[PDB]
Ligand binder design. Structure first.
Ligand SMILES: [Ca+2]
Ligand SMILES: [Ca+2]
Ligand SMILES: [Ca+2]
Ligand SMILES: [Cl-]
Ligand SMILES: [Cl-]
Lengths: 124, 124
């Protein structure tokens, strides 16, 4: 679920303020997107979006409101390391991994303040 | 999910051995069932089954393999007290409550050893 994804981010990046730092960044770190990502971080976000898209297109999965962010799963944090519980069902596991890969991707991507709250209408 | 339900049981009943104690008991504490419950505990189990039935019959919900036991939710245990996370989606919340009510029902129902591993074919 969305709240768990923000927690995953705090896990991989202790000092982070998920909502404030990674929302409304570049072209894809936020709701939907357009154009091409402006940098690694922005691409991490595009990949997360694409991952959610692949999940919605799974015949075997049906998310409430057709929004994967509503799908709650089980995961655990241990010293910056994120672990998706093997007991999550196939759909939950898929979402858990999308979030986990995104959280990790965020922790290794440069954070360019100039790309924060970017004028998407022009540069995306 | 099924594994979370067993944890809920340990929460409400510290000494319990969920699988060993509450599986294959009476007419409803196990897979499916038949007849009328033999006692309070057995009825707690029938109610849990009926609760899962109501969940499967929700137009808004679609569980993997159409089995609510695969639906993973978020909950927390604190001194025998079980709490279902308000952030679970409607379907997850419904399942979480079914499990929670069952766990609590189990903790307050007499445990009749004579009803353990009962000859269902005859008494159910
Ligand atoms: Ca996005
Ligand atoms: Ca049953
Ligand atoms: Ca779930
Ligand atoms: Cl976020
Ligand atoms: Cl059980």
């Amino acid at each position: 679920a969305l709240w768990q994804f923000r927690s995953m981010i705090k896990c991989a990046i202790p000092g982070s303020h998920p909502l404030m730092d990674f929302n409304n960044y570049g072209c894809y770190c936020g709701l939907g997107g357009s154009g091409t990502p402006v940098d690694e971080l922005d691409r991490c976000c595009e990949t997360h979006d694409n991952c959610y898209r692949d999940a919605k297109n799974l015949d075997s999965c049906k998310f409430l409101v057709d929004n994967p962010y509503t799908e709650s799963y089980s995961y655990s944090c241990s010293n910056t390391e994120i672990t998706c519980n093997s007991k999550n069902n196939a759909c939950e596991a898929f979402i858990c991994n999308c979030d986990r890969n995104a959280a990790i991707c965020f922790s290794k991507a440069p954070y360019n303040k100039e790309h924060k709250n970017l004028d998407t209408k022009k540069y995306c």
